[PDB]
Swiss-Prot record, chain A:
Belongs to the ku70 family. It comes from Homo sapiens (Human). The chain holds residues 32 to 536 of 609 of the full protein. Phosphorylation by PRKDC may enhance helicase activity. Phosphorylation of Ser-20 does not affect DNA repair. ADP-ribosylated by PARP3. Residues 246-310 are annotated as: DNA-binding. The modification Phosphothreonine is found at T424. It comes from the Eukaryota. The lineage of its organism: Eukaryota, Metazoa, Chordata, Craniata, Vertebrata. This is X-ray repair cross-complementing protein 6. The modification N6-acetyllysine is found at K286, K300, K307, K430. The gene is XRCC6. Residues 342-451 are annotated as: Interaction with XRCC5. GO terms for biological process: activation of innate immune response; cellular hyperosmotic salinity response; cellular response to gamma radiation; cellular response to X-ray; double-strand break repair via classical nonhomologous end joining; double-strand break repair via nonhomologous end joining; innate immune response; negative regulation of DNA-templated transcription. The keyword Zinc does not apply. The keyword Ubl conjugation applies.
UniProtKB/Swiss-Prot annotation, chain B:
It comes from Homo sapiens (Human). The chain holds residues 100 to 201 of 911 of the full protein. Belongs to the ATP-dependent DNA ligase family. Testis, thymus, prostate and heart. This is DNA ligase 4. The gene is LIG4. It is linked to LIG4 syndrome: Characterized by immunodeficiency and developmental and growth delay. Patients display unusual facial features, microcephaly, growth and/or developmental delay, pancytopenia, and various skin abnormalities. Interacts with XRCC4; the LIG4-XRCC4 subcomplex has a 1:2 stoichiometry and XRCC4 is required for LIG4 stability. Component of the core long-range non-homologous end joining (NHEJ) complex (also named DNA-PK complex) composed of PRKDC, LIG4, XRCC4, XRCC6/Ku70, XRCC5/Ku86 and NHEJ1/XLF. Additional component of the NHEJ complex includes PAXX. Following autophosphorylation, PRKDC dissociates from DNA, leading to formation of the short-range NHEJ complex, composed of LIG4, XRCC4, XRCC6/Ku70, XRCC5/Ku86 and NHEJ1/XLF. Interacts with DCLRE1C; the interaction is direct. Interacts with APLF.
From Swiss-Prot, chain C:
Keywords: Chromosome, Cytoplasm, DNA damage, DNA repair, Nucleus, Phosphoprotein. It comes from Homo sapiens. It comes from the Eukaryota. A motif (XLM) lies at residues 137-149. This is Protein PAXX. CDD domains: HD_PAXX_N. GO terms for molecular function: DNA polymerase binding; identical protein binding; molecular adaptor activity; protein homodimerization activity.
């Protein structure tokens, strides 16, 4: 996946879209606006490098690069921002609905071929490389050109041309009084038609709920941290890329702005002699270390040379049984090693053979790791990983090697001496009962970082000028109420068995 | 589409004239009734010629796009023939 | 179309049937109960070809179509005379063991039935879970926290 993502929102502006069947139900136009705003927010948080556009068709006024009638391009393909979100929200309310009607109009003839043509023109106007070209059609009508067949053929031809070009189109059908029949006219326009999505739809599209589900997490495309070299011998060599399947999430770095005008300010640093008052360079400086009364002076190049043992890469040392790899011997997050094949040919077969043989023998490959030049070597273990996929053939664990850092002697610390005190069988049984009561299934993505979520919510409130920032419920709390209600009298019995009455913990 | 049948047909016209191929290509795409008068067509052609003299292809492209989007397949074919300066109506200039 | 012949082929019902296969090719002659095979070998086949100045398959097929095959049986030995070429060729066969031959009769019967059927037929006609917002990224379920069983 190389390039950017392009999304164009097509919101129909017919009379039927501006009417609500039942009370306490937002009109389809407002629902589309909210969905667009949610998508904009999700794109801003996850990846702001993508391009989003908003185009309205069926309006009285027209604004297009070709001067097509009855089409308005509210926002051209550009990176999302708070200004576009506010502009969309301006039409959110009923007063916003009136403003949209006054400044845009509604209830005019339109051609699907025309909107597809303007969308294609917008796509062709992007100078950046687009990995995905997508269009979303928000419309509750299923038979727009029911009074004319030539327009239907023109729309079919335009949709076919867009499909051939590589444009991927979706129809976000909304609620209709009578019902939505995709099989009537839109079946031949959607890029992919599902067999299930054939019956008449009397409710909202399921995609709308997914779109409205805001996601707050940065999405990073696949990228190799380093294309290192694995050397089984001074002559045998292969190339392997290193990836970080797990990486700590940090909030975006702050930026300095000028209070008076709120503009970026450049930060610079300089070094000069207090006597000569002239600029100095790193090559005109020495590093000093004072131990007691003695002073030791070394050049910067010498200090860099201090931590130089071997060239960057991985050097094989041997194979060790997996039983000898302690679970508690953890120092840094593990990495993933996968064959590259873009540098040396024939490495993939060797990697596969090594993986299968290590899995059969249950042996991890011990190696010396030097991620970069002038970096002290470390001892790492590569444990083979078996490609694991859950139901419906979705991968959950890729095949390769898991690189785990083995702590050195210095990294280990000695604990204070303690006297063992065995627990009686009754107390162990009570604890077993408590644990069984508090049983729960764990998954890798069952918790959210409260700090990052709160920061994102605060930034959203600041940018959109919202009244207050919606408090983010944190799942990291132990919800003591439910645990107490579930345990019952087990805690009291355990305290009586273990804790003496005159303890007061 | 550059690899689509229409693109190859337009490009591979055996350098059955190009006007007929363009008309066939534009028939399913163009409208049924244009809205350009003779004066507007002449003005657009004059603008195209002047821009070509001035070496400005952006205006030429804009004018061609306007002509394409505001005319019918028959009008497109006749405009192409006029631009090429080859009509062959069956009656001589005399 | 593996060549084959029957003796007698006239109005009288045939008694023996001769054929060839797998050109360790050996001429197989059977009475439907007992079998006789040449048991040719590459060295023996080469020696026979050199002696007779040599493929026999075209000549065998020509004789079978023209019914120019002569049979002789004596105890466990069988003698075949083939005519049609410049000089008739003589071959000898010994009674192959029954246990080794039973698969041969079974295969011959199956092939004969298949050929009958085929010739009669011939003569008759004469990505769920993908994130919509972020393409290429799998959809991720909202964090459910701790859900006690």
């Amino acid at each position: 996946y190389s390039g950017r993502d392009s999304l164009i929102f097509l919101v129909d502006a017919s009379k039927a879209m501006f009417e609500s069947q039942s009370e306490d139900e937002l009109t389809p136009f407002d629902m589309s606006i909210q969905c667009i705003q949610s998508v904009y927010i999700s794109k801003i948080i996850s990846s702001d490098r993508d391009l989003l556009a908003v185009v309205f068709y069926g309006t009285e006024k027209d604004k297009n690069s070709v001067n097509f009638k009855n089409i308005y391009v509210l926002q051209e393909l550009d990176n999302p921002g708070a200004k576009r979100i506010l502009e969309l929200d301006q039409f959110k309310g009923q007063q916003g609905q009136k403003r949209f009607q006054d400044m845009m109009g509604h209830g005019s003839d339109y051609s699907l071929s025309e909107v597809l043509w303007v969308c294609a023109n917008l796509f062709s106007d992007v100078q950046f490389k687009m990995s995905h070209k997508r269009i979303m059609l928000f419309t509750n009508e299923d038979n727009p050109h029911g009074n004319d067949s030539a327009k239907a053929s023109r729309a079919r031809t335009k949709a076919g041309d867009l499909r051939d070009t590589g444009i991927f189109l979706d129809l976000m059908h909304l609620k209709k009084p009578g019902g939505f029949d995709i099989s009537l006219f839109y079946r031949d326009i959607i890029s992919i038609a599902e067999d299930e999505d054939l019956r008449v739809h009397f409710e909202e599209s399921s995609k709308l709920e997914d779109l409205l589900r805001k996601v707050r997490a940065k999405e990073t495309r696949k990228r190799a941290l380093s294309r290192l070299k694995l050397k089984l011998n001074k002559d045998i060599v292969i190339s392997v890329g290193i990836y970080n399947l797990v990486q700590k999430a940090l909030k975006p770095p702050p930026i300095k702005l000028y209070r008076e005008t709120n503009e970026p300010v450049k930060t610079k640093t300089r070094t000069f002699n207090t006597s000569t008052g002239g600029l100095l360079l790193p090559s005109d400086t020495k590093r000093s270390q004072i131990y007691g009364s003695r002073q030791i002076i070394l050049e910067k190049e010498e200090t860099e040379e201090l931590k130089r043992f071997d060239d960057p890469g991985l050097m094989l040392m041997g194979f060790k049984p997996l039983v000898l790899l302690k679970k508690h011997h953890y120092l840094r997050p593990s990495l993933f090693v996968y064959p590259e094949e873009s540098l040396v040919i024939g490495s993939s077969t060797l990697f596969s053979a090594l993986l299968i043989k290590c899995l059969e023998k249950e042996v991890a490959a011990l190696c010396r790791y030097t991620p970069r030049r002038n970096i002290p070597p470390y001892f790492v273990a590569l444990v083979p990983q078996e490609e694991e996929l859950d139901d419906q053939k979705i991968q959950v664990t890729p095949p390769g090697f898991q690189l785990v850092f083995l702590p050195f002697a210095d990294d280990k610390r000695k604990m204070p001496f303690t006297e063992k005190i065995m627990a009686t069988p009754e107390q162990v049984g009570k604890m077993k009962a408590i644990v069984e009561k508090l049983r729960f299934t764990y998954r890798s993505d069952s918790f959210e970082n409260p700090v990052l979520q709160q920061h994102f919510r605060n930034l959203e409130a600041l940018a959109l000028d919202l009244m207050e920032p919606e408090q983010a419920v944190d799942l990291t709390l132990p919800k003591v109420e439910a645990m107490n209600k579930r345990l019952g009298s087990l805690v009291d019995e355990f305290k009586e068995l273990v804790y003496p009455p005159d303890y007061n913990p | 589409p550059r690899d689509g049948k229409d693109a190859l047909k337009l490009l591979n016209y055996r350098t059955g004239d190009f006007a007929m191929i363009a008309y066939f290509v534009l028939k399913p795409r163009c409208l049924q009734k244009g809205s350009l008068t003779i004066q507007q067509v002449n003005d657009l052609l004059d603008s195209i010629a002047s821009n070509n003299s001035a070496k400005r292809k952006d205006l030429i492209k804009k004018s061609l796009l306007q002509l394409i989007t505001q005319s019918s397949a028959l009008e497109q074919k006749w405009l192409i023939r006029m631009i090429i300066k080859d009509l062959k109506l069956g009656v001589s200039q005399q | 179309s593996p060549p084959l012949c029957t003796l007698p082929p006239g109005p009288e019902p045939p008694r023996f049937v001769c054929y060839c296969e797998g050109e360790g090719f050996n001429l197989y002659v059977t009475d439907a109960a007992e079998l006789w095979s040449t048991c040719f070998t590459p060295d023996s086949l080469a020696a026979l070809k050199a002696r007779f100045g040599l493929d026999i398959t075209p000549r065998f097929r020509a004789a079978c179509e023209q019914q120019a095959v002569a049979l002789t049986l004596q105890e466990d030995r069988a003698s075949l005379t083939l005519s049609g070429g410049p000089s008739a060729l003589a071959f000898d066969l010994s009674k192959v063991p029954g246990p080794e031959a039973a698969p041969r009769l079974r295969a011959l019967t199956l092939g004969l039935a298949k050929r009958v059927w085929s010739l009669e037929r011939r003569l008759a006609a004469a990505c769920p879970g993908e994130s919509l917002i972020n393409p290429g990224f799998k959809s991720k379920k909202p964090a459910g926290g701790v859900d006690f069983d």
